[PDB]
Amino acid sequence: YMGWWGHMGSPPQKGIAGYTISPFAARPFAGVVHAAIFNTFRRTKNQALFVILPVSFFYYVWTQASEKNEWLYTKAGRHELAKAL
Amino acid sequence: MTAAEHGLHPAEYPWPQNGMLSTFDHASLRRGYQVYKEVCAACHSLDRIAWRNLVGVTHTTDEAKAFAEELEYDDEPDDEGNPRKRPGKLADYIPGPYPNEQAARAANQGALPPDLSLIAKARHGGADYIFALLTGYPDEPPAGVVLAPGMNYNPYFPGGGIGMARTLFDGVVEYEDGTPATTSQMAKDVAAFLTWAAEPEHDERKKLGLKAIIVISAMLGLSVYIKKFKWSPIKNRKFIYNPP
Amino acid sequence: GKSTYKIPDFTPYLKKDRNTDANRLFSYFMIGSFGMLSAAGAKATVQDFLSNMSASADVLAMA
Amino acid sequence: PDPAIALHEAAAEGPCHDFKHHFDECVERVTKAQEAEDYDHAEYKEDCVEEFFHLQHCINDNTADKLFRVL
Amino acid sequence: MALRKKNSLLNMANSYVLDSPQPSNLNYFWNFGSLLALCLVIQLATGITLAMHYTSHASLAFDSVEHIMRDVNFGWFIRYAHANTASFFFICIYAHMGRNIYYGSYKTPRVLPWSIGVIIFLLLIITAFMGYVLVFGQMSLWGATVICNLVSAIPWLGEDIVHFLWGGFSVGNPTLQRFFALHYLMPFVLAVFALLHLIALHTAGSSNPLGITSNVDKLSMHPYYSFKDLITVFAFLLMFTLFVFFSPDKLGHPDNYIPANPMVTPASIVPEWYLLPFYAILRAIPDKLGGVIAMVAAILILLILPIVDRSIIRGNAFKPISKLLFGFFICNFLLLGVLGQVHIEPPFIVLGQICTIFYFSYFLILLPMVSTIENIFFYIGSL
Amino acid sequence: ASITSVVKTSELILKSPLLSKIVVPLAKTYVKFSGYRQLGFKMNDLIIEETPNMQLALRRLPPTESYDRVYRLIRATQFSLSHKLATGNDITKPEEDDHYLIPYILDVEAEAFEKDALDNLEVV
Amino acid sequence: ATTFYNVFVKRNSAFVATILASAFVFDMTFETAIDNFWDRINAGKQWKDIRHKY
Numbered sequence A: 001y002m003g004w005w006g007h008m009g010s011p012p013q014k015g016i017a018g019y020t021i022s023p024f025a026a027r028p029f030a031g032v033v034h035a036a037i038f039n040t041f042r043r044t045k046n047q048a049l050f051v052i053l054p055v056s057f058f059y060y061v062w063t064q065a066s067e068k069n070e071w072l073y074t075k076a077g078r079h080e081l082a083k084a085l
Numbered sequence B: 001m002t003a004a005e006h007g008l009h010p011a012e013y014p015w016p017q018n019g020m021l022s023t024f025d026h027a028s029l030r031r032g033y034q035v036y037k038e039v040c041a042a043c044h045s046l047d048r049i050a051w052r053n054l055v056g057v058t059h060t061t062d063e064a065k066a067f068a069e070e071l072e073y074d075d076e077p078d079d080e081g082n083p084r085k086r087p088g089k090l091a092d093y094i095p096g097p098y099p100n101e102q103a104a105r106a107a108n109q110g111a112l113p114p115d116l117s118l119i120a121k122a123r124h125g126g127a128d129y130i131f132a133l134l135t136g137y138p139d140e141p142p143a144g145v146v147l148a149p150g151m152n153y154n155p156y157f158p159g160g161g162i163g164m165a166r167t168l169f170d171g172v173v174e175y176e177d178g179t180p181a182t183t184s185q186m187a188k189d190v191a192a193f194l195t196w197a198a199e200p201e202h203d204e205r206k207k208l209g210l211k212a213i214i215v216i217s218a219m220l221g222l223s224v225y226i227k228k229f230k231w232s233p234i235k236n237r238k239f240i241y242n243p244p
Numbered sequence C: 001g002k003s004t005y006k007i008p009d010f011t012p013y014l015k016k017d018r019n020t021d022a023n024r025l026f027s028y029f030m031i032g033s034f035g036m037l038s039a040a041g042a043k044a045t046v047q048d049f050l051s052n053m054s055a056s057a058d059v060l061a062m063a
Numbered sequence D: 001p002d003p004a005i006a007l008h009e010a011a012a013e014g015p016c017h018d019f020k021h022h023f024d025e026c027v028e029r030v031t032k033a034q035e036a037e038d039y040d041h042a043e044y045k046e047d048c049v050e051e052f053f054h055l056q057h058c059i060n061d062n063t064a065d066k067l068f069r070v071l
Numbered sequence E: 001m002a003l004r005k006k007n008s009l010l011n012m013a014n015s016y017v018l019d020s021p022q023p024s025n026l027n028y029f030w031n032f033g034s035l036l037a038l039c040l041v042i043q044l045a046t047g048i049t050l051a052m053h054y055t056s057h058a059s060l061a062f063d064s065v066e067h068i069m070r071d072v073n074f075g076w077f078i079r080y081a082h083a084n085t086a087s088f089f090f091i092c093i094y095a096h097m098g099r100n101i102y103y104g105s106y107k108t109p110r111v112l113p114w115s116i117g118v119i120i121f122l123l124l125i126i127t128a129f130m131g132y133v134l135v136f137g138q139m140s141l142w143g144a145t146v147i148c149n150l151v152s153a154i155p156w157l158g159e160d161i162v163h164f165l166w167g168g169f170s171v172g173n174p175t176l177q178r179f180f181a182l183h184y185l186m187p188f189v190l191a192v193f194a195l196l197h198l199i200a201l202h203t204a205g206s207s208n209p210l211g212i213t214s215n216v217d218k219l220s221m222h223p224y225y226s227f228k229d230l231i232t233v234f235a236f237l238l239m240f241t242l243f244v245f246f247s248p249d250k251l252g253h254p255d256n257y258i259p260a261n262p263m264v265t266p267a268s269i270v271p272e273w274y275l276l277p278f279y280a281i282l283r284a285i286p287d288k289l290g291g292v293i294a295m296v297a298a299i300l301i302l303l304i305l306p307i308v309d310r311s312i313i314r315g316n317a318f319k320p321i322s323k324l325l326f327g328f329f330i331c332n333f334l335l336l337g338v339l340g341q342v343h344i345e346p347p348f349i350v351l352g353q354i355c356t357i358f359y360f361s362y363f364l365i366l367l368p369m370v371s372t373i374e375n376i377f378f379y380i381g382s383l
Numbered sequence F: 001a002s003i004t005s006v007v008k009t010s011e012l013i014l015k016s017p018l019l020s021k022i023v024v025p026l027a028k029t030y031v032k033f034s035g036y037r038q039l040g041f042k043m044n045d046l047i048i049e050e051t052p053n054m055q056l057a058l059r060r061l062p063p064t065e066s067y068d069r070v071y072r073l074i075r076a077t078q079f080s081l082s083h084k085l086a087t088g089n090d091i092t093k094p095e096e097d098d099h100y101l102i103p104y105i106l107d108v109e110a111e112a113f114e115k116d117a118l119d120n121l122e123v124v
Numbered sequence G: 001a002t003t004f005y006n007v008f009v010k011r012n013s014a015f016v017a018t019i020l021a022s023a024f025v026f027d028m029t030f031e032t033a034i035d036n037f038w039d040r041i042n043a044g045k046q047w048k049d050i051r052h053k054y
């Protein structure tokens, strides 16, 4: 499924013209400030839920479990610990 | 587990060596050596430290040679193959108070005082644990605590009952630099000294780290420039399509 | 859009002084600095690391 | 004398007063309970370790920095 | 013809590091492969150097490690580098495997590099397990004891196999000397399998974040990906620097600075952090043999991803529901890791069982269901 | 899963009034959040192509469809590497998201599946 | 800029020679600079600071 240069396995290409300029002719950091702020904000906003939802759920579950475990091993939690074991 | 079973967590004290760019205070190290020598060394060994280790850290070559030369170490047998002793040298290790574990336990109601060369790394808390433990013997155990025979209450120790009694009291040591030898001062000095004993590369390691951080950061910045420079023809590519 | 002789717009990226020696020299200064730090970092690394093979402190103590 | 003694006393009477009182009340209860007969044949013998830890933890938070500043 | 193409030896190197045609749109998650190569090179360099100063005999092992720390010039650095890079090796390998699962790198035509990859991961685990025993501190000894006693669960022959592994009736000198020899060997085996999985990959080439063919638009490996890999090499070295020089013991267990003592049992025997999720899975099953099988199955089940993923599209970039499921799967795997080092106490016991069920149900139920439904949604949604 | 399976199951759903009433709106929102149209792709551009069946179906595409698909892949690859989204005419409109490939692959698979069945025929 | 390019950059042999010479100078000067800085931020704490008493 992959060939090599000259016969890479692409369907025939035709009709596309590609253009570019030398690295010495270009500003490598052109538009860096706009990208760093606006592009990153757009990219982050669109992915935020896929991180927030699972992280917040599993952090909540952990927090509840760790707090219960702590409470069960106090004096106040003696009776509930006895039942839990 | 109960909090008692874990032991109380020690406070975070502001040690001189805390801090990415901070060394130990060598004057505190020297004073801590003196506390080890006059208090702890009755029960605890420091087997991984040789006299040469103190030189240029806490003591001069001559002071350390003087400490070594006061002791006797086993020499090679004489010409009839009989045992002999020699005076100590800088290469020798600091000798421990007991010949073996059995002797150590017999002197300490069954408990075995650990070697202290690695103790700062071998316990959660490090210097803070050592300082907290030495200064954290309450006059009276919390009401309801039943100590096993030969145990002392100390909340920092897991379970609360430790075989080591309180040993630091105001003025048990007379510091050679005139510092007032309070319980707190001696615990701070000895904790610093034992931290040094566990990690004697500390000062050098952190200075080399500073050099590494600076060089690597600069190289990271330049590698970003060079990557972006080389990639700009790809990133800037434009297309015009005319469907055949 | 259709003519392939009309070059797409590269004005947002093009430097005016792209053919000058100063322009090239700057980029070679960055490449050079990076090579320089890499050489200094390699030398430090090699020296410190290989020194493990030289007599250790306990060997020098018995000399 | 040991600077810690004064700093610890000040912290107990001041910012850690609630915890000081809890520990005190606990001690009173436990000692009284030990005084009463058939304590040795009880199922549950209360201690004051928990209250002690809450107090000590509080004192340490209010003192650690101050103590090392005067050493 | 250029020499790099004409000469057969040069041409093999050329094919992998220079002319190798890569997709033009690989993101920074394609940098973990070369970071893993860097970890391997550091472990070989530091490990062979430690082997020049280490003594594998149980009477001297722990002390030889203290001699390295205290007397060998830069011994502290070489030891801390080796110990911390073992952790970084696992961070990079989990990132690399996470990328592969998210982007569908296990799908045809890349089943074979993925399957060899699963073996690489098993070899890494064994290598790191044996290396940790070599210190012969408390955790070294007790971790070896508990982990090797899992083999006792093998029916009929299990006990005999354990005594054979140990070379005696408990973990001792014979065990330590054999672990040294095998720890030295296993990284060479791992390097071979790493090379094999890249040769297998080279038939299809790298996948890319869009999941489509890159045969339409290729870029040479050098200079593009060479220079992109340098960025993360220096980012890695900065992380490495902060651990090795400023916090060299953060990732370790203090008990491993106590010499091994068969009498005294440490308060808690836990594996190194990178093994914790597998340990939680083992604990979840009450049966001894059950627990062992589940723990092995938790790794071997990666081999069925090419089958249970029913999607007609490679990778998750365009699959919102798959992305949510993947996020839950990852966070569950981290929670299993945390539960691997809590005490066996309520309510962590039941939590560990629910998380274990969720771990397996991702492969067996959820991914096949979600991938089936998304196929239908793509087709109906775009009609 | 085979394209055949996906197409047939979808057709079962589209037949059922109840099912279509609940599934078609979900499928349309799914496609909106999928966001492949914001890289100028058509849905069929995403189908895995590294199989014999798919390579055969791609060879059967009319040359114009084939050249346009090449361009859309190259254009999406350029948006991906730049971290940009399509704008204006590059965004695929819902009316442009045509199933140009589905008929070719359904014919390839129909033959492949018939061949498998007929390889297992038993003279009665 | 032309002159500088022509002498130090144009020939790779000269470029590499200049990079290595610069690395040598950097290495020596950086060592000295870090040493002085480290001594100032950790003043009074090191052995070299208390050695005179003994």
Ligand code: HEC
Binding pocket: B035, B036, B039, B040, B042, B043, B044, B108, B111, B112, B113, B114, B116, B119, B123, B130, B133, B134, B157, B161, B162, B163, B164, B165, B167, B168, B190
């Ligand atoms: C005369 C006896 C004695 C003296 C004096 C003594 N110790 Fe100990 N120490 C012990 C014994 C016994 C143990 C073991 C306690 C146990 O395990 O129950 C011990 C344990 C310790 C521990 C380990 C506690 C643990 O977590 O396992 C440290 C740290 C310690 N000592 C430090 C010191 C320092 C610092 C000094 C003095 C400056 C000191 N000791 C003085 C007898 C002593």
Ligand code: HEM
Binding pocket: E040, E043, E044, E046, E047, E048, E049, E050, E051, E054, E065, E079, E082, E083, E086, E089, E124, E127, E128, E131, E132, E133, E134, E135, E183, E184, E187, E190
């Ligand atoms: C995949 C590569 C490797 C990994 C993941 C790895 C992992 C480990 C680990 C986790 C330890 C315990 C470190 C500690 O806490 O002190 C260790 C120790 C050791 N490793 Fe390796 N190792 C690798 C390669 C090698 C190689 C190639 C050698 C060559 C002999 C080696 C020699 C040693 C030695 C001698 C020790 C004991 C001394 C010490 O603890 O530092 N390792 N290794």
Ligand code: HEM
Binding pocket: E029, E030, E031, E032, E033, E034, E036, E037, E040, E093, E096, E097, E100, E105, E106, E110, E113, E114, E116, E117, E118, E120, E121, E190, E194, E197, E198, E201, E205, E206, E207, E208
């Ligand atoms: C020593 C450990 C490893 C090394 C050095 C290594 C190295 C690499 C390299 C350099 C690549 C190509 C660049 C990249 O995609 O990152 C690669 C790709 C791949 N590796 Fe690994 N790898 C290792 C372990 C693994 C493991 C454990 C797995 C799977 C469980 C795996 C599966 C793959 C797959 C499927 C690919 C192709 C991914 C793609 O380009 O889409 N590898 N590996």
Ligand SMILES: CCCCCC[C@H]1C(=O)O[C@H](C)[C@H](NC(=O)c2cccc(NC=O)c2O)C(=O)O[C@@H](C)[C@@H]1OC(=O)CC(C)C
Binding pocket: E012, E013, E016, E017, E022, E026, E027, E028, E030, E031, E033, E034, E035, E036, E037, E040, E041, E191, E194, E195, E198, E206, E225, E228, E229
């Ligand atoms: C020296 C001749 C022997 C050929 C094998 C040498 C190494 C080799 O193939 O190099 C390449 C640089 C490779 N990277 C890639 O493929 C790559 C491809 C796409 C994108 C990126 N980066 C994106 O941003 C890549 O980095 C890589 O890191 O692989 C090592 C593991 C190989 O080492 C070995 O297997 C032997 C041992 C160290 C495991």
Ligand SMILES: CCCCCCCCCCCCO[C@@H]1O[C@H](CO)[C@@H](O[C@H]2O[C@H](CO)[C@@H](O)[C@H](O)[C@H]2O)[C@H](O)[C@H]1O
Binding pocket: B204, B208, C046, C047, C048, C049, C050, C051
């Ligand atoms: C092909 C490569 C050529 C051969 C490689 C050479 C191998 C060994 C060369 C020198 C190794 C020892 O060289 C010696 O190294 C250590 C650091 O490593 C230096 O020591 C210097 O830095 C260290 C920490 O970095 C400090 O503890 C020390 O106080 C300071 O003097 C010595 O100044 C140098 O004399």
Ligand SMILES: CCCCCCCCCCCCO[C@@H]1O[C@H](CO)[C@@H](O[C@H]2O[C@H](CO)[C@@H](O)[C@H](O)[C@H]2O)[C@H](O)[C@H]1O
Binding pocket: A003, A004, E011, E012, E013, E014, E015, E016, E019, E195, E199, E202
């Ligand atoms: C660091 C230890 C590793 C040492 C081994 C050194 C090389 C690494 C793998 C080489 C072994 C296989 O490498 C072998 O070489 C040939 C010829 O270059 C490669 O062939 C590849 O490039 C050639 C031309 O460059 C293409 O025509 C071909 O389509 C492509 O597959 C294959 O990938 C593989 O069959």
